[PDB]
């Protein structure tokens, strides 16, 4: 699934995401929108280090989901990769909040610091009712 814009902003808002752990709904939205471009089936291998990128978050699999595949890997999420691929994000929001409860927070989102950190983030959330 792709998400409209607004759309995601409100979903994001009911799973209680806004806030969380500092973090304001409009730096998630600025995530999603880098990391996926708000696409729930959206997946990258990276070739170098033998692991994947899964969902609308891109969650990777050597950390925080199972997918068999990836040397060494943890599951702290204590998801099947495949479930952050489904249309309904509840379990990647749940898995996402698990990622910046940890101190790094959004900074492990690679694409977070370069796109979002010290930016004007208000047009993601611009007109969306939340």
């Given at each position: 699934?792709?998400?409209?814009?607004?759309?995601l902003?409100?979903t994001?808002?009911?799973?209680?995401?806004?806030?969380?752990?500092?973090?304001?709904?409009a730096?998630?939205?600025?995530?999603?929108?880098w990391?996926?471009?708000?696409?729930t089936r959206?997946?990258?291998?990276?070739?170098?280090?033998?692991?994947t990128?899964?969902?609308?978050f891109?969650?990777?699999?050597r950390?925080?989901?199972?997918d068999?595949?990836?040397p060494?890997?943890?599951?702290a999420c204590?998801?099947?990769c495949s479930?952050?691929?489904?249309?309904?994000?509840?379990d990647?929001?749940?898995?996402?909040?698990?990622?910046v409860?940890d101190?790094?927070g959004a900074?492990?989102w690679?694409?977070?610091r370069?796109?979002?950190?010290?930016?004007?983030?208000?047009?993601?959330v611009?007109?969306?009712?939340?």
């Amino acid at each position: 699934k792709v998400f409209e814009r607004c759309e995601l902003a409100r979903t994001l808002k009911r799973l209680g995401m806004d806030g969380y752990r500092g973090i304001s709904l409009a730096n998630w939205m600025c995530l999603a929108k880098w990391e996926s471009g708000y696409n729930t089936r959206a997946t990258n291998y990276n070739a170098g280090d033998r692991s994947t990128d899964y969902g609308i978050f891109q969650i990777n699999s050597r950390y925080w989901c199972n997918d068999g595949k990836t040397p060494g890997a943890v599951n702290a999420c204590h998801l099947s990769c495949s479930a952050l691929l489904q249309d309904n994000i509840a379990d990647a929001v749940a898995c996402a909040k698990r990622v910046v409860r940890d101190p790094q927070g959004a900074r492990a989102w690679v694409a977070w610091r370069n796109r979002c950190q010290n930016r004007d983030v208000r047009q993601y959330v611009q007109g969306c009712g939340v």
